[PDB]
Short mmCIF file of C-alpha atoms and ligand atoms in Angstrom, two decimals:
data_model
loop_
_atom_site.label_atom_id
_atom_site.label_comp_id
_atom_site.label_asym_id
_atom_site.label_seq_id
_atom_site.Cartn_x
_atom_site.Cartn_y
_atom_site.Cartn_z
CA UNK A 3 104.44 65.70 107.86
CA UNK A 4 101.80 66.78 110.38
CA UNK A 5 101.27 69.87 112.07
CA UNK A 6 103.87 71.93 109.95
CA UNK A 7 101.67 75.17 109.29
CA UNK A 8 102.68 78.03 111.46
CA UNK A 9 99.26 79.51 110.49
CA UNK A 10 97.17 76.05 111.50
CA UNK A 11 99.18 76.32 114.04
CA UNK A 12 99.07 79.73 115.76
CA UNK A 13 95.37 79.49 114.89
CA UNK A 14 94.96 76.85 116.90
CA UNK A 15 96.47 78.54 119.70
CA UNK A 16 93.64 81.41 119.06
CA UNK A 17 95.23 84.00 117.21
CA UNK A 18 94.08 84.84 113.77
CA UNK A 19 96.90 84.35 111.44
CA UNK A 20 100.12 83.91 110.53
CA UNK A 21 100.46 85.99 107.37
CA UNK A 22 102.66 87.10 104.49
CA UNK A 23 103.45 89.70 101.56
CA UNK A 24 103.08 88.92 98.20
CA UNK A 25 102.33 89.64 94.27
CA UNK A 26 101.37 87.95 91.16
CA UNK A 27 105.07 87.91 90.31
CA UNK A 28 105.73 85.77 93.65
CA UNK A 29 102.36 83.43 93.22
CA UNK A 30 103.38 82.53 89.77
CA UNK A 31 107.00 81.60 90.11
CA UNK A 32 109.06 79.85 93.08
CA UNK A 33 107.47 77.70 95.08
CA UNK A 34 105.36 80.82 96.89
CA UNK A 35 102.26 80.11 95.88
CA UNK A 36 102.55 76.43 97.28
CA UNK A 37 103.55 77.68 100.55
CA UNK A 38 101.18 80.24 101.10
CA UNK A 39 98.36 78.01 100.29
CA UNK A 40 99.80 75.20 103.07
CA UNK A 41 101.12 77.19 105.29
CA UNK A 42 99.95 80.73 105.97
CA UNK A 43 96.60 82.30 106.15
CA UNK A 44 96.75 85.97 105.22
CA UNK A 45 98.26 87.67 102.18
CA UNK A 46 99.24 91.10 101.77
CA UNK A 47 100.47 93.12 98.75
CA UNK A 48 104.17 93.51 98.84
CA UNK A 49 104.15 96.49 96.45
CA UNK A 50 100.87 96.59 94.41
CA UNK A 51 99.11 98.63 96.82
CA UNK A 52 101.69 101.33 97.14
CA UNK A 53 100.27 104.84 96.14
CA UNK A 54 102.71 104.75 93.25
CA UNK A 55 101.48 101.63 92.09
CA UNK A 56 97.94 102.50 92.42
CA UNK A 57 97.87 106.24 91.52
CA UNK A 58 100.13 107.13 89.21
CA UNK A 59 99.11 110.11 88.62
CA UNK A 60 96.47 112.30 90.21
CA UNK A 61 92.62 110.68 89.89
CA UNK A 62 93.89 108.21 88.01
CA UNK A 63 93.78 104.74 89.61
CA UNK A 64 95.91 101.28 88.55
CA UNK A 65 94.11 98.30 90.24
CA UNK A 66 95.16 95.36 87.76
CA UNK A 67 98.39 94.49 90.23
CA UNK A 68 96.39 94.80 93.89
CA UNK A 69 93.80 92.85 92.09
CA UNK A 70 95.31 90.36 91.25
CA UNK A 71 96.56 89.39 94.95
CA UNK A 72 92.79 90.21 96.22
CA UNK A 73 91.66 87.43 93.68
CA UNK A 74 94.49 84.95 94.65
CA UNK A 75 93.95 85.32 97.67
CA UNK A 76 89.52 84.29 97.58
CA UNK A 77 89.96 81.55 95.55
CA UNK A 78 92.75 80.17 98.03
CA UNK A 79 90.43 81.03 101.25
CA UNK A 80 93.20 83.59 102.85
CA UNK A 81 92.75 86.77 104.35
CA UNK A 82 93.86 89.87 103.11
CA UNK A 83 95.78 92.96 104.66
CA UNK A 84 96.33 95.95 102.60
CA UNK A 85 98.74 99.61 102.33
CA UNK A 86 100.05 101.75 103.22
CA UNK A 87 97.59 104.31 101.65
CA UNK A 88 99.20 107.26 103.86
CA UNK A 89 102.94 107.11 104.48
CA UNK A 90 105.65 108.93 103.02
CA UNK A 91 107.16 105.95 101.01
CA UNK A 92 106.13 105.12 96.91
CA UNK A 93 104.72 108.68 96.59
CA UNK A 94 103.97 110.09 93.19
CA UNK A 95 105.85 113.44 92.96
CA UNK A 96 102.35 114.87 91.59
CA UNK A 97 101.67 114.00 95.41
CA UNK A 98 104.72 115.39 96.98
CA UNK A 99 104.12 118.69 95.15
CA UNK A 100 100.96 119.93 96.56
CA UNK A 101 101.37 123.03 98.91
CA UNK A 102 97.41 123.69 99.27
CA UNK A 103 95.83 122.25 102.70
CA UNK A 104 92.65 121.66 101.21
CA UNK A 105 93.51 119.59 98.11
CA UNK A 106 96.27 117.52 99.81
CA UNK A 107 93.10 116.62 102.07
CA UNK A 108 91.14 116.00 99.08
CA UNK A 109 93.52 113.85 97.26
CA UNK A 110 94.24 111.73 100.46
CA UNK A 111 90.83 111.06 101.11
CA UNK A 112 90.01 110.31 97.39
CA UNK A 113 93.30 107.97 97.28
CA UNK A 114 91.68 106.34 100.43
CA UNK A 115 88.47 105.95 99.35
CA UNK A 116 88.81 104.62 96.15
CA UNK A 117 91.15 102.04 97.11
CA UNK A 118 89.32 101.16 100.14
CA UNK A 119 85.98 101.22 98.02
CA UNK A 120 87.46 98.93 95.29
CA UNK A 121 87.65 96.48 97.98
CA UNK A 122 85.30 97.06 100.37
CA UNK A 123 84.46 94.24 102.56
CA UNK A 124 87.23 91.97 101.16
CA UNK A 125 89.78 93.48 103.21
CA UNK A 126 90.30 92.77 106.65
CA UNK A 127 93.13 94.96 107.66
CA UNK A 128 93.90 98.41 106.27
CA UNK A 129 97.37 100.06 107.01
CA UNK A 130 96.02 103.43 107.04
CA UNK A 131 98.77 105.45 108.24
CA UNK A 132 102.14 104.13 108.19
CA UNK A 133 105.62 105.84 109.22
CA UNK A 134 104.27 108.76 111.08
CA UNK A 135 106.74 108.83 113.57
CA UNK A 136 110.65 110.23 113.68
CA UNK A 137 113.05 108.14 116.03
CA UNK A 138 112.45 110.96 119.22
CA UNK A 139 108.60 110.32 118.89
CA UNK A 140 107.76 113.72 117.19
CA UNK A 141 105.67 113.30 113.88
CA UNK A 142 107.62 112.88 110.75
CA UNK A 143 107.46 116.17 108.73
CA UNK A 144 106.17 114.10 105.54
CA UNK A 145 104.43 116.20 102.88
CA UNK A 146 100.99 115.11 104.72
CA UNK A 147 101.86 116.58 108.11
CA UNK A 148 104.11 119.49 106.23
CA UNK A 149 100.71 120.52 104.10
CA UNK A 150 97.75 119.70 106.26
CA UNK A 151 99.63 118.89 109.72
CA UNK A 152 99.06 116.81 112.74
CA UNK A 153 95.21 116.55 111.65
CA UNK A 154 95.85 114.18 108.56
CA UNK A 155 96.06 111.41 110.64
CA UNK A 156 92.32 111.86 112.30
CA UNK A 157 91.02 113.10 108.74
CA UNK A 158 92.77 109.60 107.38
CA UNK A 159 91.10 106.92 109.52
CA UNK A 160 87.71 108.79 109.85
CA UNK A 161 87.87 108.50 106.13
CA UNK A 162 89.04 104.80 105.99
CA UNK A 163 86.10 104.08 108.58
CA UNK A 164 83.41 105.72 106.42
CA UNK A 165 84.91 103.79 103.46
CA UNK A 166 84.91 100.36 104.50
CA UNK A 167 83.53 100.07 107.95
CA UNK A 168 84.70 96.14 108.30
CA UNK A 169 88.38 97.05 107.65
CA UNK A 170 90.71 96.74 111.03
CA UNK A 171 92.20 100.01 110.27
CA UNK A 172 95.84 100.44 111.42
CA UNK A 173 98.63 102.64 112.02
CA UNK A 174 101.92 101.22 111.25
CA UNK A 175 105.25 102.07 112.10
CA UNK A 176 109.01 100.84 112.51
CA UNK A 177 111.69 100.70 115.26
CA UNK A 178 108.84 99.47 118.24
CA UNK A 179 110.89 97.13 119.11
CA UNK A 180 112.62 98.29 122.33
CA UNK A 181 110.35 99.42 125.33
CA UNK A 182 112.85 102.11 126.14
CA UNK A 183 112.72 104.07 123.03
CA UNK A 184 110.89 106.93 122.54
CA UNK A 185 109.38 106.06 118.82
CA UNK A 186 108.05 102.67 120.80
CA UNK A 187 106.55 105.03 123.64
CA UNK A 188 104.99 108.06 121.43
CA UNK A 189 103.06 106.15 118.95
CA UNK A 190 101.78 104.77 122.18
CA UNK A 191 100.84 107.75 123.42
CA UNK A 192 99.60 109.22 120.51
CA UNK A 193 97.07 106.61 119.99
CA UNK A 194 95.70 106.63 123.13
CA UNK A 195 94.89 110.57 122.43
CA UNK A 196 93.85 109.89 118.71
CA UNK A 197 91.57 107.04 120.13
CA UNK A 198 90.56 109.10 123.19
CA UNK A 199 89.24 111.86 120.48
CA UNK A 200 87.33 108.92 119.13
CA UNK A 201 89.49 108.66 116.02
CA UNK A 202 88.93 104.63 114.49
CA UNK A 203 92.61 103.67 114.95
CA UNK A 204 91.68 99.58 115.70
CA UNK A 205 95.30 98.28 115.43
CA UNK A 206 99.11 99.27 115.74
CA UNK A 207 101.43 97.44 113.06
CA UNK A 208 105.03 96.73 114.11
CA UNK A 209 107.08 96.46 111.36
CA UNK A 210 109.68 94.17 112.34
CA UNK A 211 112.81 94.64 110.30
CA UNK A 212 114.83 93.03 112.65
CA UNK A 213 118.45 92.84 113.36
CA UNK A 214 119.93 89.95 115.22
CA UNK A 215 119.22 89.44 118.92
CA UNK A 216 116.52 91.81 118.72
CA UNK A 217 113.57 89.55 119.02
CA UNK A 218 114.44 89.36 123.16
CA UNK A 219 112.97 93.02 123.18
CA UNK A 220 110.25 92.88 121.23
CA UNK A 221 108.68 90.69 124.54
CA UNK A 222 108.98 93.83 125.98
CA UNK A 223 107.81 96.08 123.16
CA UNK A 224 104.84 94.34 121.98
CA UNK A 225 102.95 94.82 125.40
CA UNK A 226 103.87 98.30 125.59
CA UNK A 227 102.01 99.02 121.85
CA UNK A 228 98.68 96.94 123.24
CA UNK A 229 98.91 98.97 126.20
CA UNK A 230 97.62 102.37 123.52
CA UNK A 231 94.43 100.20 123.62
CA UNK A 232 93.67 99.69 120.54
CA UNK A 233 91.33 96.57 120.07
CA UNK A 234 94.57 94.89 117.96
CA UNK A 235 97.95 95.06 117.36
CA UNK A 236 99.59 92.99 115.05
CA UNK A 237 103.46 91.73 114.05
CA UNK A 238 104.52 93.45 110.64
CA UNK A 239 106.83 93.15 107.69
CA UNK A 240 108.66 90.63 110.05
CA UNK A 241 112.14 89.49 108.80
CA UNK A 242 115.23 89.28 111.14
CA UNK A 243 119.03 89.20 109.96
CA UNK A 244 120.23 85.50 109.82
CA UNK A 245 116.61 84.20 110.94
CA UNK A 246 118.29 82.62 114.32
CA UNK A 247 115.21 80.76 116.05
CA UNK A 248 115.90 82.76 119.30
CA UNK A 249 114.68 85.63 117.42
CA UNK A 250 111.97 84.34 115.63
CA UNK A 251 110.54 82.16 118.71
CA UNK A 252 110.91 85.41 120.87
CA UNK A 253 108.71 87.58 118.52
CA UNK A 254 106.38 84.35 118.34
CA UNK A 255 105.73 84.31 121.93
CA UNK A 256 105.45 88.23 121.98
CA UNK A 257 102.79 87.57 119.71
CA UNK A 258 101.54 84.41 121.82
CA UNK A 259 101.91 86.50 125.21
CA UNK A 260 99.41 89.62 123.94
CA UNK A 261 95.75 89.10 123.98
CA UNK A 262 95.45 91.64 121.32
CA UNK A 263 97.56 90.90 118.96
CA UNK A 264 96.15 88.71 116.29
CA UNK A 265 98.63 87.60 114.12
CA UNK A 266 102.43 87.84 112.39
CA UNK A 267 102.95 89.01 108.82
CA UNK A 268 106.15 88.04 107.33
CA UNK A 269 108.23 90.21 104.88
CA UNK A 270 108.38 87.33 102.20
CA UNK A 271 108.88 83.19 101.88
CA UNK A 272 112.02 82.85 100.37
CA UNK A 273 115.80 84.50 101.36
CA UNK A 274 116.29 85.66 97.88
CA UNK A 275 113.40 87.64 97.48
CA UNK A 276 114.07 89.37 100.38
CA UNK A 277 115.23 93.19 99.88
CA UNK A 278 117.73 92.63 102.26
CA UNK A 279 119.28 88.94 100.82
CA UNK A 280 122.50 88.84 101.86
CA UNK A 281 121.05 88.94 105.63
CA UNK A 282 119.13 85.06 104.96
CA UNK A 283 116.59 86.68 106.86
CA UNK A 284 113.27 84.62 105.80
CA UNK A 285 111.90 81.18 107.24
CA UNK A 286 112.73 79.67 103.89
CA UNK A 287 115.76 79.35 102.05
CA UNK A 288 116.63 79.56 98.10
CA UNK A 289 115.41 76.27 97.40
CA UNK A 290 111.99 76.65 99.03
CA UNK A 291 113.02 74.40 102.12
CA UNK A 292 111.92 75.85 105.62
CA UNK A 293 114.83 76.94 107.83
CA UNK A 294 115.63 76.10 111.66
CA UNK A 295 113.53 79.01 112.17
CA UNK A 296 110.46 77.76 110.55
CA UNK A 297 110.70 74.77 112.19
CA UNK A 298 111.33 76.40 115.67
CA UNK A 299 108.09 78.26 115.00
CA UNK A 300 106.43 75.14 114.32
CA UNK A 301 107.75 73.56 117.66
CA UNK A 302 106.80 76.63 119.73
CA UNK A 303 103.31 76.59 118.43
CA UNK A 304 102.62 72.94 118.66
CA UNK A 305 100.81 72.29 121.59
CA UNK A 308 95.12 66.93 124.80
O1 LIG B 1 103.31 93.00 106.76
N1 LIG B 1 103.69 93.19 105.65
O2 LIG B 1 104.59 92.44 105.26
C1 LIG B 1 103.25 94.29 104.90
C2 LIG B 1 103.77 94.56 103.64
C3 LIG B 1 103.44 95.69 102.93
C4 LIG B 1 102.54 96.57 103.54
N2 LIG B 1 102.05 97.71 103.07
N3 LIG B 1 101.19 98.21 104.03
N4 LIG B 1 101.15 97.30 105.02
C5 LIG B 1 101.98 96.28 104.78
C6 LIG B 1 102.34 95.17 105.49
#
């Protein structure tokens, strides 16, 4: 049928992409691979980027898995977003054990660099920083902020920028998706000093790990993150319990309504592969077939 890419689709209504997260293990089972190709325009590594993944332990790098998804994704002509290479999530514990300031530093910029290096002008968004943030706005007391402190974040991007100066580099976090609350309004603010000190934050990630009847907010929510202004922001991770259309065409049009936000990522293509299953929260079901939601996507985009 025509016109049934939500990535043809939202291009054509000048936004970048409409992206989603994936592996090898995905492209070569399913009908994933098939569906990315017709219907999305950005891949990202579900897991094969993690520091655990990619690191195991300390100097000593594991590419074959990230590569993999980098190579998929040339030879099918899609962009590529990659992370989280700071965040508390998938660390090594040879990570989470350093005490010394200067050699936490070290190691972060080496994990940075290498992984940015390996790819270096492939990439076009980095998740740089990811997770920063506790639910009152303060930074999260991770092992990065607990060993080097509130200067990671600076030292992380500057190094990202010097590795691969055509990345978008990002910060990402979750729970932006009400105006009101103060994780929503202090990455906000905290960008705008970061970026005020000149620090290369391009782009704030939502990660959109939505519960139902949440996409109304997000209208609200996505403005407020372009408002740090960074030169993009950009829909993460999105999946929403029981995928009702109302959700998904609301984050759409959040999307649709902010100049600088370039694109959606979604968590995964099918319901079962989901982490979260049992919620049906993905735009297509068990059997590969698009849900209401896709198709409410596909109707919102449409447009002589
Ligand atoms: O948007 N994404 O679905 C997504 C998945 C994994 C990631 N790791 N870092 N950034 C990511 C974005």
């Amino acid at each position: 049928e025509a016109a049934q890419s939500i990535d043809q689709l939202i291009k054509a209504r000048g936004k970048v992409y409409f992206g989603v997260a994936t592996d090898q293990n995905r492209l070569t089972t399913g009908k994933n691979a098939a569906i990315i190709k017709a219907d999305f325009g950005m891949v990202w590594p579900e897991n094969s980027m993690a520091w655990d993944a990619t690191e195991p332990s300390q100097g000593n790098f594991n590419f074959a898995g990230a590569d993999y998804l980098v190579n998929w994704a040339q030879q099918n002509g899609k962009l590529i977003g990659a992370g989280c290479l700071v965040w508390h999530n998938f660390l090594p514990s040879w990570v989470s054990s350093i005490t010394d300031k200067n050699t936490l530093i070290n190691v972060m910029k080496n994990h940075i660099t290498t992984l940015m290096t390996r790819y270096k002008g492939k990439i076009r968004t980095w998740d740089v920083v990811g997770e920063a943030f506790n639910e009152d706005g303060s930074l999260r007391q991770n092992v990065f902020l607990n060993v080097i402190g509130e200067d990671y974040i600076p030292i992380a991007f500057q190094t990202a920028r010097a590795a691969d100066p055509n990345a978008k580099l990002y910060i990402m976090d979750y729970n932006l998706d009400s105006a009101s609350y103060p994780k929503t309004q202090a990455i906000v603010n905290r960008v705008k000093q970061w970026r005020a000190a000149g620090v290369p934050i391009d782009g704030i990630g939502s990660q959109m790990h939505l519960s139902a009847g949440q996409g109304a907010g997000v209208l609200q929510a996505l403005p407020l993150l372009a408002s740090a202004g960074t030169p993009e922001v950009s829909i993460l991770m999105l999946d929403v319990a029981g995928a009702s259309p109302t959700d998904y065409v609301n984050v759409v049009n959040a999307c649709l309504n902010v100049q600088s936000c370039v694109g959606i990522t979604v968590m995964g293509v099918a319901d079962p592969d989901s982490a979260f299953a049992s919620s049906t929260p993905l735009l297509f079901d068990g059997n590969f077939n698009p849900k209401p939601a896709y198709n409410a996507i596909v109707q919102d985009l449409q447009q002589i």
